[model samples]
Target: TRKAVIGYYFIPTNQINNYTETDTSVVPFPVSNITPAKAKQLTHINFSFLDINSNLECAWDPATNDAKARDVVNRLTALKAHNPSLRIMFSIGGWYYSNDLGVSHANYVNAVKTPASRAKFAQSCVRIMKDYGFDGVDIDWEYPQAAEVDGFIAALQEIRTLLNQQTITDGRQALPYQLTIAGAGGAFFLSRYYSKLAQIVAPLDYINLMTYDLAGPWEKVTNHQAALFGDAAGPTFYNALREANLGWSWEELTRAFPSPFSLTVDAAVQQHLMMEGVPSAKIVMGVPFYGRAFKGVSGGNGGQYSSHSTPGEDPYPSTDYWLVGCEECVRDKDPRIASYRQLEQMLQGNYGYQRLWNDKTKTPYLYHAQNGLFVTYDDAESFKYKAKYIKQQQLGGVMFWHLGQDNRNGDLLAALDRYFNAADYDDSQLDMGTGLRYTGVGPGNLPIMTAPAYVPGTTYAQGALVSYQGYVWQTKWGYITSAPGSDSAWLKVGRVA
Candidate 1:
């Protein structure tokens, strides 16, 4: 009934479909982390970027070709059977295509420039969706700017028409397939075609903003990769672009130019999209599961505005497609991107890593002054505020960059589920203490909640009451798996006799 909570997973393959971790010490692969338990929490799951070939057909994704990938994809399809409402979509094109090489955009531009190319591409997308049992297709075009907007819209129009035609003729009692896009968040694309982009977005199911990575190694000084807003102490979006000569010497870059000067998804949504007439329901905010690490920082203001060792460095250290696209690889063996789970281990009081929250940006980072290590990331706390922001803004939903890198316990996912659900919770039944006082409507108008059950997948929100170990328990924050006695979130109330 409510809007969706979408999760993106960049599935990994090649290491033998064997999910069995040989060492209890090594982090599990992304494929190993998407347990059936985790699937139930998501309303929609997007498989990140099935690249587009030169012929405009979906390229051979290892996930579709390899044994491990097939097994994982098959398992994910099984999740749809278990949760009838879940929707799975295949994403095509990503930053690698648009930003890294512009190949995907070039291919798309070449294909969509004509009616014949547009129809051919659309048909290919339809065939891919049907062949793979995907509920829909998400176009991650990286971007369509200036003259390319018309071609982008034409492509979508043809794709939507073709998809509808299939639903009409297929004759199965299946839901109509959906169409969506991962659009640009920076000012470059959106500001140029704001009015026309609305028409482009009109036919789609939703538009997910590429909101993260607002700042990177390119900026000599450190900045939040994804903050909710621009730093009050720093420059606003308009002023930043004007003041800084970060290349792009073209004078056409005016103050009105909608570049991601703001550097916050909040500004992208509220000041840009909403102001440009895009409905909040049609916009999905993007969240990154990874953090950018910069070495050789001054550590002033916790590494903010600090000079970098290398300007224009890629946040991800490795050049390998899989490792670079998903995990940041600083070392050949170790991943470069710092996942929230990994950040948890390096947190304050753990390994000399001091966590600092920026009130100006409403973001959190870890700075090790001893070693000039600065990491900007998001955890449960920051995500909690984002969840609340989505609700307050009445936006469609939130979409993460990738899944699996979350802590082994899935703490970040739990926080998202709880906070998202909390927005729709019936406050009348809220207890605000040990979560021991709620029940779901079940068969014959009965309450389904029984003895306190510790479901590893169940998301317990603040004020949730559950019957646990013969006693009524309440939750102080979001939690998953941890038993009532072991979890600090759960408070023991009256004992069940």
Candidate 2:
């Protein structure tokens, strides 16, 4: 089955060259990094952002610096030589461009507020897509809060109307142009969009749920940012979510999470939205190429569910660049948001970092127990797990951001590709419980689990497998255990079946 394997190719040329102020592990990823080989793996590459000009025209953010954006756009367009199936879309209004820092800069409010204004911008989107060879338009809009929902739906209607008319007018290859949104994955935000998303789905091919950042600088705990499930927080987890409605405000629901309905991939997208009204086939799950780090964690849970040094603090410094009640990505203290490629280098153990997998959430995190720094991210394994979920749920495929952050030749994307588009995809490669299973209960199943038992005094090396007690401790941390918990002379890695 051909699925929509979408990747958000971040287009800001300036950030492409960004290096951590004090760290050097991150590789400089430019448009050049997205080779023809990599482009072939994806169905669509959403050119991460452009913004609405004050004149209600579609324009690149930091207008003067877009020479590189234009060049990058053409570079991606040129990749059609290798993958004719690849589509590129220009996204407008990200968090930085659209949302107010605190009160309301709300850039999209005025632009999409009136029908006349929305019609003019829709024309601009069509003109730009035609001129620049963008296959379609993607609205990032950060968020269209309560007052802006009607306008948001109207904006999509206008864009779809024009895109449909223009495609027919072209006369030759009348492939219907695509429309989509970087939809919010937070329950409160999704709830706000609930009533209209069913309406919103008509014009768009899929809704890209920004599922990562479920936990971030905005929160206090060192929780998984993008977990398949929340913290096994009991039935009240469902009860907490059941209390909410489409008309409720997002203010309290989202802030104190890892609670109520924890910011989870399943809760916000699969369970909530899909259960409510949205179609699964039109929903694209987001995977992050970058990881969120929390420094100076309180420990005890190996930095998994501990409190951060600063509660409810923004990890990066607020430069007031976004104004209102804004958090700034620029001028971060320590490397709060590190790319996956960067973490690969940092996890070398030479940096005193040990990787741990949480079976409950099905996500990975790097812990430096000595100093208490926990970094949460999705890896090749997590990617495959998510892809398996997409397959099981029969949802629209996967979407990952920052194509540049993957390892050389797109290691992470390759993982997603195996399940998303690869022919002869091996379901057996996924975890035992996840794929095909025997309907009848047998006395004893040989492959009940892929992992062998936690045999003590056995120094298994590489492909470390976790036990029933949670984490599969690695010798790389220099403190391995004969049993699950307390450390011992455990050397090397345990193999996972």
Candidate 3:
């Protein structure tokens, strides 16, 4: 059996759930927040504390909108009282939240480079977490490529060190709970770059590869939202691994989510997440709570709808909208739109025939047709498939793009809940308690005098820090067979990877 982990996305408390039907009809709902009854069902949940950089100072400023940060802490404290074990994390580094990095790049890349700044920021984060009674901090750095990569790594090191120090000095019962990295999905994420990401944060709890929003109407056409093939005609597995797809318009819905191309990409990601060293126990399969819809889609993969009903038109439609919208990643008062400079925004710039799969770079993509529409979204079926993928691979479990998008009955929530709560989830497989369950589960009869049991294949991408015994270790005694025996520390069975 494996761990049945689940997490939900949360924005700050002060923000209003301005979401409405296309017809301007406000959907009747509770104050946009999760109640304790539902909170207990999760292993952990993430709260995007969008404004922690200024030491809680930015929290109230409209320019910084730090009020949202305080709101999230308040709600999360309420949630934890009910589920003592439900780990809540504070996420940092949003789009605008990053310093002004010249629209074309990201802010963290430079900020993290300055160890002083990084340490200050990390320390500030922990202080805020302690104040709010949070378990840990979640670092969501957009990307750390080129010159900024080294700075990114350095910043992580400083942050990790800072967090550990807090455990000792601040009197945390445990090691500040956990440290996680929220990364991009698919190939670019699992690529050589993550090799650095792994090296820097290997000691952290786990790395969450987003795993969705591969291609949308912003793309050309005919692609899955998620794809498995690393170089499939659709997006690469990494590209799909680290993203979310709300509709194109921020305040409304459109054919920006359920685009045909997005499905292809989504499928690819589910497959690739299970390769050799990528243990399911540590991977967090991402799920979207909404879907994409087209209004004037005349034909050909645009999803044929009999009438014209879209984001601003009839507003209210019989079916669910493609996206609930990506507000957690938004920038300032522009909350209704997707993060202005985020990847989604980058993808939106092209409405023409865009890259379908940068065959040269081995990346799949989407581009709009001359006269058609597109959308990238997630619904129960897609969410179901994502949940199923988590179960099939025995991965860490699933997390959704948000908590407020779906209604009270918990329609989409119920779909995923049903799948994860199934009796078949063998959670004992993840317990490292006695160091004995490792061998008992499946890794053959635990041998003695072991090193580590690792797979012998190139399917696993490099930079993946794994305990190995297979190809890397050639013992003086034969190739290292008996090491797999019990009592053999070398016979390593489970993995933090």
Candidate 4:
């Protein structure tokens, strides 16, 4: 090895771990949805849910997970038809199946309750998945019952063990299966189950936090679905990080600093979770493909509506179909409502919720005084904030809840694209702040960043800068004197090891 091997390994599989695809009630896409172009970018597709029980009627049957996988595969194959870096996985047990798990959860069994029965059930899952060319399985047992939680953890551990056994015993290509759990958001969820599960299966590949759904209409008041920080982190912040002999405060450890306020509370909670020992790379931040619509007035008369827009029209009255996150946007897909692009314009031009930069939060939020509308939906700007958060935390690439609801050109995706596509290596003063790579990639330079290739061996030290490409960067990493991208690009990236 040349000192070390630094490269990426992308498994060509589709991950179907959520309900949206399998549940036609949510997103109704056919063979055409998983376009060849889109499939190439995806490594995993979560083949949604399959209700366990006598009615083991797989959701994809009328819409079974497997059937859905087949449909998705037809498209993946389209991509693989041209490019072959594609794989697929099936995830069972979701919020819908939590209660279905019932008492047998402790043993990973059903009502008849036999270890063999659970194993067989698991085997059946494997058989169907493997039959459909699935690469692995994701057990999303929403919860394993209070008493059976440990056993549920054991059950997944056991599954991994069995795979190894088969690999050796049969002398066949062992099906490398994946075992993961969909954890609820916050410290409570992580501390409760993960603390125990981590001890049992510390080697598990990924533990995804169902990090969205953190805020919704469940509360009487309106709030952001994903607030980077909470209004109440002062005390809770201290309690989380005060460990034996460890002098770090939660805020300090989480880089929840430049604080006191504007720390964006929800993001702080995510930071706290990672600080308490979760691997940041595996700590994927969740983004909703939707927005929250608050009905009651924010500050004006009786709180029934904001100011200008009435409850039923602008603020969007809470109806039977009301859901938080991207679903808010999906709802607009109705013929009665305007297109999402139109809505964006309305928010910007008419409502004045124009994409704003929350300098204090270093994130994005929308505020409309006339309608008293203060909606905090993650847009291109907000996504950039969270993307930086992920980079700062050194976490894995982000995992959005659903992909399509984003603005035109998949605005959210495009924002993510811009973030990721702009050369992994740095070439400017900002790159220095990152401090791990050479500044020879994207725009900016002393003369101006529009040129290419640095003048060879022009040793650049601190304060000694260059102007190559169309950007400005220091030869030494960690502090940019100037920038020339979008206004938000001017953020001072925090330095962390």
Return the top candidate by lDDT: 2
Please, what is the TM-score per model? 0.73, 0.75, 0.58, 0.59
Q: By the TM-score metric, which is better: model 2 or model 3?
A: 2
Candidate 3 TM-score versus the reference = 0.58
TM-score of 1: 0.73
lDDT per residue as tens, model 4, 42-148:
54455455445553312232323545446554443354464343445556666545543342232233421446554666566556655665555566565544445
lDDT of 1 at 441: 15
List residue ranges in candidate 1 displaced over 4 A.
12-32, 61-69, 103-105, 170-174, 192-195, 235-261, 274-277, 314-336, 423-497
Residue 431 lDDT, candidate 2, scale 0-100: 66
RMSD (Cα, Å) of candidate 2?
16.4
Error of 3 at 83 (Å): 1.3
Candidate 2 TM-score to native: 0.75
Q: RMSD for all candidates, in order, please.
A: 18.5, 16.4, 13.8, 14.7
The global C-alpha lDDT for each of the candidates, from Candidate 1 onward, is 0.66, 0.67, 0.46, 0.43
Per-residue lDDT of model 3, residues 199-239, tens digit only: 54455566666666554333333334443322223232222
Please give the range of 10 consecutive residues that has the lowest summed lDDT in model 1: 435-444
Question: Which candidate has the top score in TM-score?
Answer: 2
